[PDB]
Write a protein that binds this ligand. Structure first.
Ligand SMILES: Nc1ncnc2c1ncn2[C@@H]1O[C@H](CSCC[C@H](N)C(=O)O)[C@@H](O)[C@H]1O
Ligand SMILES: Nc1ncnc2c1ncn2[C@@H]1O[C@H](CSCC[C@H](N)C(=O)O)[C@@H](O)[C@H]1O
Ligand SMILES: [Zn+2]
Ligand SMILES: [Zn+2]
Ligand SMILES: [Zn+2]
Ligand SMILES: [Zn+2]
Ligand SMILES: [Zn+2]
Ligand SMILES: [Zn+2]
Ligand SMILES: [Zn+2]
Ligand SMILES: [Zn+2]
Ligand SMILES: [Zn+2]
Lengths: 154, 431, 439, 340
């Protein structure tokens, strides 16, 4: 129940590639960095990810994405990727995720994405989602500080 | 950008063939073919030809050019039981110059398939257009997904009643089809939100449908309270993602986002790992929708859509994409001994049908019936016979022409659905 | 203020103190010289009041309530029977004068009210109720009016060996109720000429009956050669429009003018199409109109046709209020009406699934236009109105009868409102089976 | 498209349009018939009003409306005696030229265009033979083709029996005086009228077997079968118009001879011209006959324009100028009935 393996991650919109730097700043190393957009690794696009790709490259631990045209386009592709990368039913492996969205978005979208993710919205003049206890880098640093719960810790 | 003139001149000299000739485009290197005449089509023209073929204007004719699918005005064929219109400049460049005006000065005009013909110019028809056009839409290539795994057969004395779920229930076509096949329904949970539609399911089916609520309110916990399910039907609203309205919002905006309410709620009801009970599903939407989204519905469901046109079993023009994993969903369509193929079979007394096949029917309303020497139109009790519905089915809750026709304009076709659910009589209860 | 024209309180005190009776004075103005009886209570009426109890008795508002007092038929003031199963209303001028002063004072504030036809019978001074008011009401409208005419001739019975199909001429056909009823009985209709001018009734009668009935143009364009060619007819049926004959219309024209002239077309064609002198074939005919009409028009019609009407209410056989007059010479036309085992006698027997009726019988055959017009039925715990499929059941028509020519609620309801009633017509036509060929 | 009256007047002045291409009264195109006084078409919306609004005369003896438009905004009387023509302001000033109406309204005494002989003053000219056009416009101009009534045989001097009349809708004595001027034997006379008193032969010194009766609402078939048989039935206008016609029709139907009867039976019915077209066609259809006009201003002062629906012999024969018209109509009866 201690000294876990280095974490491996899958993400959408790696972008600035600051996730690896943030992870290394906390004093831990990432076991495998996986990304797909068109040791930050870029291979293909989100639109050409299949089930077998997740079978060969998974399983993962958490996902960093969000919505920094339409919100539905990226949101539902994110939902599909997360549903493909979900851990099998009736198991115990730790698993996290994350979704970002701007404040300016209609109430109907709030309703749909609260129904879909099955988690109630949480405000931060800022928005955050997910089941994780806890741009502008201080909020990501605050979220990644308790990362030791499911990381390498003796 | 080589204009079609010099290649049209060259191909007449038999220096090559039209396998490299894009009829609507001219530019060489085609990635596909053309299923009406001999020739090929490039990717850019193929994308437009996939979409723009299957609509029909209020005049009862093909909206755009058959070959080029472009132009503001062109000739209109005037032959009965035909509606295809040809382009003007598509003729004097390819088939021959001077025939655009000589045919215009004389009436009636006949398109090149109405009259038997030979290879005029370089426009030679495909000898098998009837089956070449059919394979263009169903035998496509998006990702060549794997075939579904057939469940092992279930013998007698181990057949349990089916627990049907239904989203966007409409006028309850699924229940009607399931009770005509002979299958024993043990439950049916519908999620219609229209007051006029609920009064049709309640009165006609004697309150055997558990009308629950809006689709968007059914949360996770409710499924196991009502479930477990065995058949998850669903058809999203088709008024947004279509090449008929100027708005034409995508699948991810507007009311087009009502598809995910089907996939997400299909995920919940499928059996967990270690469970080996039969489980089925199905989805349905319009074909006249952008090719940039046709490969999305197929990706999420991880299946390939079939095409079934109602003209093979009915007296109306309607064809749409069917997803799902029903057993034997790819078999050829065969009509029956109790179908209504032509208009004269679906008319009241003292009326004579001019045409033989109604064109596409929608919410909005040439006239097709003449009685007592006076031109007439179709009644509300005649649109029910076309689709296979029992007569007087919609005579409920004080509705007239403007309401008994809007509901039938967006429904399913009974004998089309009866073709998909037929192999469902082997895994569930019967009699 | 005179002796012959005494006030109401004078006769009330005279009968209260036993110096006089009630059957010698009029109950609406206090006059002497009674000419008739009062059908409900005890007393008499004067010729001015008997000739208004025959017009305004069967008139109801749009919300199902009588517009006039039940005693005097004069609405000086109106307070209603708040209890259900009653449309009655008693006027204030009749309460304190006969019952007692200040009675309307407590009758207005106490809630709810219950009319004098609802209470168990007593004698509230001089306002008392007869034991058999229904039987006297039935004879009020069909006795002691106008003159007396000779009884129509009765034809000898025809054996079943020699019987022929019935030939029918139907002026103002409507939606062909006569053909429907005659086929329901089981009489072979060998010919049926119908004269209608409405383009939708033609559609109904053409579609539903598979073109077995022959149509004719306007009734004002039919000559005598036409009747000679199409005949010999055997049953001349007809009902004239009542647009300008009913006393509901403020701008009435009555007979002799306007739309009321169309009775004379029936009269003329019936004279043309009847057997000549020295002919012994069975000829039957029938005419019908509304009860709420002036006595002058009714007496003129009786004088022209040479017979007295009978009143048949379509409430002992169905679930509606429908009072009409019937002139004719059909056999057994004045025998009491008894409902059959396959009669939908209540409103709940003519409803869809999951709908519950709050009443038992509906008012005059409809959608003051509040809290009783939008509330004849309940469904899913809410107020709802009747459906066209349910009106077709109330009137006794086959279901979905008017589902042709893609017409909506308004047109179907309009066609159904002015139609006939199938049970009444079947009762009238039942004895015809003894003269013509059956099945 | 709709042309005004002044524009139409200007067009006719230039002779760019004929006189039979538009309505004379409303000034619009699409004629349906011709105008009797002048030459000119008539639209159906304007034509129908002319047969019912042309002979409206007041008790003073003037035309009710303008002789041209018949729309009574204003009236200009004619100073000539026995003249019944009236003029408005627009029908002349707008149509035949500006200032014509003002000029014609100042010269007192004033002579209307009908009084003076035929002249074409502007764009309106009187017809050459309008005297027959006036009659052709009204009688037999519209309707069916009902077969003419048959002509009864004559009984020469062989037992001419006295007449016996049922006068219904007239004066009580009117119709009896005329029957006596010609010297015809009256074997019975059963008079009647709309609501009145019932009495014996005694009301005045008249003793002619006059069984005077009250309201017709008291006569039944038994009375007609007992008081008859009859040989002549009268009626006509002396509220509305339906009462008279329909009571007369009922009594005629009751008194009509049965099938196979050869004895003569004559009847009549008269009414003023000022009645709507619907009443005219209803009377013609019910009585199965067409009306003939007998213009009577020259033969009887203050009486004219009476239609007649009868089977009297030689009704439409030409006349050679209360008493006069009825006497002329009833004169042929001397051949069938008793004399002196
Ligand atoms: N928000 C919502 N929740 C539940 N149903 C809805 C809905 N919005 C639209 N619908 C229903 O979805 C239907 C789509 S039309 C498809 C009807 C159905 N396929 C048939 O057999 O006819 C409409 O009839 C509408 O009543
Ligand atoms: N001029 C005319 N000639 C013949 N029929 C006419 C007419 N004018 C009106 N009618 C018809 O006469 C009908 C009177 S309502 C009575 C119809 C009939 N009793 C029934 O069963 O309903 C109307 O429906 C109207 O269509
Ligand atoms: Zn191309
Ligand atoms: Zn083209
Ligand atoms: Zn063609
Ligand atoms: Zn009185
Ligand atoms: Zn009263
Ligand atoms: Zn009561
Ligand atoms: Zn005119
Ligand atoms: Zn004038
Ligand atoms: Zn003059």
């Amino acid at each position: 129940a201690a000294r876990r393996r280095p974490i491996r991650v899958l993400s959408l919109f790696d972008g600035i590639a600051t996730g690896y730097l943030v992870l290394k700043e906390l004093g831990i190393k990432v076991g495998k960095y996986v990304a797909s957009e068109v040791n930050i690794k870029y291979v293909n696009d989100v639109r050409n990810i299949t089930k077998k790709n997740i079978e060969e490259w998974g399983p993962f631990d958490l996902v960093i994405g969000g919505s920094p045209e339409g919100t539905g386009r990226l949101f539902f592709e994110f939902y599909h990727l997360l549903n493909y990368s979900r851990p099998k039913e009736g198991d115990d492996r730790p698993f996290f995720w994350m979704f970002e969205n701007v404040v300016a978005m209609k109430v109907g979208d709030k309703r749909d994405i609260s129904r879909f993710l099955e988690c109630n919205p949480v405000m931060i003049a800022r928005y955050f989602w997910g089941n994780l206890p806890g741009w502008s880098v201080p909020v990501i640093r605050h979220l990644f500080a308790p990362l030791k719960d499911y990381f390498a810790c003796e």
